[PDB]
Design a protein around this ligand. Structure first.
Ligand SMILES: [K+]
Ligand SMILES: [K+]
Ligand SMILES: [K+]
Ligand SMILES: [K+]
Ligand SMILES: [K+]
Ligand SMILES: [K+]
Ligand SMILES: [K+]
Ligand SMILES: [K+]
Ligand SMILES: [K+]
Ligand SMILES: [K+]
Ligand SMILES: [Mg+2]
Ligand SMILES: [Mg+2]
Ligand SMILES: [Mg+2]
Ligand SMILES: [Mg+2]
Ligand SMILES: [Mg+2]
Ligand SMILES: [Mg+2]
Ligand SMILES: [Mg+2]
Ligand SMILES: [Mg+2]
Ligand SMILES: [Mg+2]
Ligand SMILES: [Mg+2]
Ligand SMILES: [Mg+2]
Ligand SMILES: [Mg+2]
Ligand SMILES: [Mg+2]
Ligand SMILES: [Mg+2]
Ligand SMILES: [Mg+2]
Ligand SMILES: [Mg+2]
Ligand SMILES: [Mg+2]
Ligand SMILES: [Mg+2]
Ligand SMILES: [Mg+2]
Ligand SMILES: [Mg+2]
Ligand SMILES: [Mg+2]
Ligand SMILES: [Mg+2]
Ligand SMILES: [Mg+2]
Ligand SMILES: [Mg+2]
Ligand SMILES: [Mg+2]
Ligand SMILES: [Mg+2]
Ligand SMILES: [Mg+2]
Ligand SMILES: [Mg+2]
Ligand SMILES: [Mg+2]
Ligand SMILES: [Zn+2]
Lengths: 111, 101, 118, 147, 49, 53
RNA sequence: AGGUGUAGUGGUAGGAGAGCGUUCUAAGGGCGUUGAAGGUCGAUCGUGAGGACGGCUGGAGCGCUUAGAAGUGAGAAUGCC
RNA sequence: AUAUCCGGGAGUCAGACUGCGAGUGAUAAGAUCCGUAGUCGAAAGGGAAACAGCCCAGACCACCAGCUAAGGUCCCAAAAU
RNA sequence: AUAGUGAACCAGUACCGUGAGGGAAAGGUGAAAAGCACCCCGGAAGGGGAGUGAAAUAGAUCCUGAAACCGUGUGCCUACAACAAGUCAAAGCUCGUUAAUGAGUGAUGGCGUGCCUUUUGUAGAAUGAACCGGCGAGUUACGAUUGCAUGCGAGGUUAAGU
């Protein structure tokens, strides 16, 4: 009744690098958060921005919250499942590759 | 006013209205207990026993018998594939001091 | 019949981990590290129940020594004098009088000094 | 009963004492001073709490060095660079840095931990008879019978 | 007798000793065999006589 | 040369103290009001120094 | 059935004794959609292995007593997955 | 207050240092090899700064009680400046 | 379902090998699909509502959902300190229990060189373990012999077989 959330699951991005961007917006107003993400060149910014914009859309369309007062009350990146690959290395052996994914959640509250 | 009494192989300072915990006394809960080995009576003045104050007594009532929290003795020697474990709960008697004579 | 591992293994390890709560990092997290440290804690706890008795008698004697000197007497002479006067007050009680009831400690010191002279 | 007294930080009042080092052997001065700094002279002594007093040492230049200590007692220190061993004699310290002579002697006699280092700060040494700490109203500590 | 109250005669039945099940049993680790040598080996030991 | 010991959680966290992003130099566009990087053309309205460019 | 008294009670290899817990069988006696097992949490009990009791989770089974049989207890094998 | 004897079950067959008595050695070795006693091994505690084998002493447990052993008592650091 | 056949499942398959030959992994929504119409953000993926359902934190990677590991919030502590990291003593602060001479944290002080194996002797600058979970080692048959137990006793007892 006071908050809305959005999550992007199994996003093909590194959780560690996504958290670098997520840390920039935690506790910030949605308007400030959008500006930060827009001018962050790192890849996860575009993904996080869509999750945030999805959460803001949820707050207005589903719960009729005042968009202009929304703040980022919670934001975190959880590890998704890892796709297992292999890179052939020198002298006939292979080395594993972790192609990691992320669960990204953004919670936004009326104030 | 206070006194020092000899109980349970130890010595405990005592004041009327205060509850002490001592080694298990063989007296039922709620019964009267009297300590006749008083070694010092204090307060306004001071009385010193040699070793016991002459004819001084401390009276109290056993509120409760209980057991202290369990202490574990675990004995082991490194590399000697040998350990021993033992539990213990020491019984106590809680005595309310009612009169220092 | 076949007896699979079941839940006994997990139950046992969880007891050890509970004993390791508050230990640093892996020592409260990993069973093997936690068990090794719980064993060392047991060794220390048993040894230290003996040592705590030494430490407190050491504390009382030092406090009695300070109070004795404030009454013109060394610790060792005071305990000799109290022994001569047939005073059985122990070091825990004397240290308590030294701090909380100095007048009573002085009265004891005077009896000891009297006994030393005799 | 677990009723043994324990001192707390801030409850115990710390007094200020002046000790005269004149013609007192360095070590015997330091030993009695070290005990005061630790609180060993007071019945409230509590090993994990600072309960000792403040000590002003005056006339450190006239501290006594028995035997040949003035020329044969050597204070080594290493810079931790190779061949970085530096030395000075006790006699040379007494003439030029008598605070260091007294402070070094007392430092060795205090515990080598946080509390002991804290207790060392309560020591103030002056070469000569006068100190700037009259505002603390220090009282004379007569150590003739204590050494 | 009753099937829910069976009782063997005293001393008629004993509990088997299982070796290599912890040190406090007294037969943990080396299982009573001691340390190394031919008699510590599986199937170890010399023929009778 | 290989790690002699695995790095603990605390030590790894301490090393990553300085592994972070920064968002420096954002201020409002003088033409449209949306936030922009200073000394850069506003990506929203395309203006700079009060002029459409 | 217990009580008193005296003495004794470090321990590797190893001997002896007595138990804890696991799965299954039999009989008896029970508990379960008014929530079984399992999971998780708790400041609980016993001399030890270990045992309860609550909250939460969970959604079907499972204790207890006596006796029986065991693929019956793991932290180490550069162990296997 | 143990001794034998009969039988079931073992483990052990690398020992170490210290004192004392000898050999080997250079009356060298933390050397080697016997004899003899002890400790370690398989023994925690106190002392010897740290220090299996030295000195004191053998931990069933609880105590914020007392007396001692070796060793100690100016400060670190308990106790005689 | 790491068991039980190698194979509960499209397994002698995939995969490896020139070939003979070697040889896996992989079961579970729900009573019923009633498997989320429609709306909203998004290119989609994926979410948020709205619904279905007893329950969807049962949404198909679907029962339960441990641990390692990764993260978010924060009650207490931490930037003069050399620390197998605990233990004993302990202020302060924050909490209130299977109500118990309670719980969490912990300045500061004393003491303190992991576990295992193997050794005369190992904190060992000997060995082994990255971590967590599961699996993983004195068994059975026939005989010998001793203890205990029961039956009978100068007797005891059947085997094959029906
Ligand atoms: K054997
Ligand atoms: K502009
Ligand atoms: K429960
Ligand atoms: K392993
Ligand atoms: K010898
Ligand atoms: K012996
Ligand atoms: K469910
Ligand atoms: K935390
Ligand atoms: K500590
Ligand atoms: K090696
Ligand atoms: Mg190639
Ligand atoms: Mg297992
Ligand atoms: Mg059997
Ligand atoms: Mg044994
Ligand atoms: Mg083992
Ligand atoms: Mg072996
Ligand atoms: Mg051997
Ligand atoms: Mg052998
Ligand atoms: Mg004993
Ligand atoms: Mg079951
Ligand atoms: Mg098994
Ligand atoms: Mg493992
Ligand atoms: Mg030799
Ligand atoms: Mg051996
Ligand atoms: Mg020893
Ligand atoms: Mg050893
Ligand atoms: Mg002293
Ligand atoms: Mg003298
Ligand atoms: Mg299979
Ligand atoms: Mg399964
Ligand atoms: Mg298979
Ligand atoms: Mg659930
Ligand atoms: Mg599930
Ligand atoms: Mg400093
Ligand atoms: Mg600081
Ligand atoms: Mg060797
Ligand atoms: Mg090692
Ligand atoms: Mg090393
Ligand atoms: Mg290794
Ligand atoms: Zn603009």
């Amino acid at each position: 009744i006071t908050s809305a959330k959005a999550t992007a699951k199994t996003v093909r991005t590194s959780p560690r690098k996504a958290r670098l961007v997520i840390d920039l917006i935690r506790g910030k107003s949605v308007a400030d958060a959008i500006s930060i993400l827009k001018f962050t060149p790192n890849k996860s910014a575009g993904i996080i921005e869509k999750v945030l914009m999805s959460a803001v859309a949820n707050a207005e369309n589903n719960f009729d919250l005042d968009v202009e007062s929304l703040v980022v009350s919670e934001a975190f990146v959880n590890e998704g499942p890892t796709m297992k690959r292999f890179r052939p290395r020198a002298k006939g052996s292979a080395s594993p590759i972790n192609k990691r994914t992320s669960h990204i959640t953004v919670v936004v509250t009326e104030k | 006013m206070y006194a020092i009494i000899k109980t349970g192989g130890k010595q405990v300072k005592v004041e009327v209205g205060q509850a002490i915990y001592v080694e298990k006394l063989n007296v039922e809960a709620g019964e009267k207990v009297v300590f006749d080995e008083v070694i010092l009576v204090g307060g306004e003045s001071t009385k010193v026993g040699a070793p016991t104050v002459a004819g001084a007594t401390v009276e109290g009532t056993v509120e409760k018998h209980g057991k202290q929290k369990k202490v574990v003795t675990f004995q082991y020697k490194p590399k000697k594939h040998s350990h021993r474990k033992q539990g213990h709960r020491q019984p106590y008697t809680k005595v309310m001091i009612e009169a220092i004579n | 019949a076949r007896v699979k591992g079941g839940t006994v293994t997990r139950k046992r390890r969880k007891k050890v981990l509970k004993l390791a709560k508050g230990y640093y990092g892996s020592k409260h997290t990993l069973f093997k590290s936690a068990k090794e440290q719980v064993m060392n804690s047991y060794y220390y706890a048993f040894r230290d129940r003996r040592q705590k008795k030494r430490d407190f008698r050491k504390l009382w004697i030092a406090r009695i020594n300070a109070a004795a000197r404030m009454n013109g007497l060394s610790y060792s002479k005071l305990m000799h004098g109290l022994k001569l006067a047939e005073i059985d007050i122990n070091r825990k009680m004397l240290a308590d009088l030294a701090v909380n009831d100095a007048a009573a400690f002085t009265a004891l010191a005077e009896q000891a000094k009297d006994a030393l002279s005799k | 009963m677990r009723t043994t007294y324990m001192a707390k930080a801030g409850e115990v009042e710390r007094k200020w004492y002046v000790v005269d080092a004149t013609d007192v052997p360095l070590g015997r001065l330091s030993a009695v001073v070290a005990s005061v700094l630790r609180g060993k002279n007071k019945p409230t002594f509590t090993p994990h709490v600072d309960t000792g007093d403040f000590v002003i040492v005056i006339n450190a230049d006239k501290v006594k060095l028995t035997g040949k200590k003035a020329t044969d007692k050597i204070y080594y220190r290493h810079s931790m660079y190779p061949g970085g061993l530096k030395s000075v004699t006790a006699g040379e310290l007494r003439d030029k840095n008598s605070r260091r002579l007294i402070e070094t002697s007392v430092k060795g006699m205090l515990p080598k931990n946080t509390l002991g280092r804290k207790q060392f700060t309560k020591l103030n040494v002056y070469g000569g008879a006068e100190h700037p700490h009259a505002a603390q109203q220090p009282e004379v500590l007569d150590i003739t019978n204590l050494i | 007798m009753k099937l829910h109250e069976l009782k063997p005669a005293e001393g008629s039945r004993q509990v088997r000793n299982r070796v290599g099940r912890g040190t406090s049993s007294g037969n943990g680790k080396t299982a009573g065999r001691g340390q190394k040598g031919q008699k510590a080996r599986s199937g170890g030991g010399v023929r009778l006589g | 040369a290989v790690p002699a010991r695995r790095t603990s959680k605390a030590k790894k966290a301490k090393r990553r103290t300085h592994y972070k992003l920064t968002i420096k130099g954002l201020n409002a566009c003088s033409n449209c009001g949306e936030m922009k990087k200073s000394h850069h053309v506003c990506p929203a309205c395309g203006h700079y120094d009060g002029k459409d460019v």
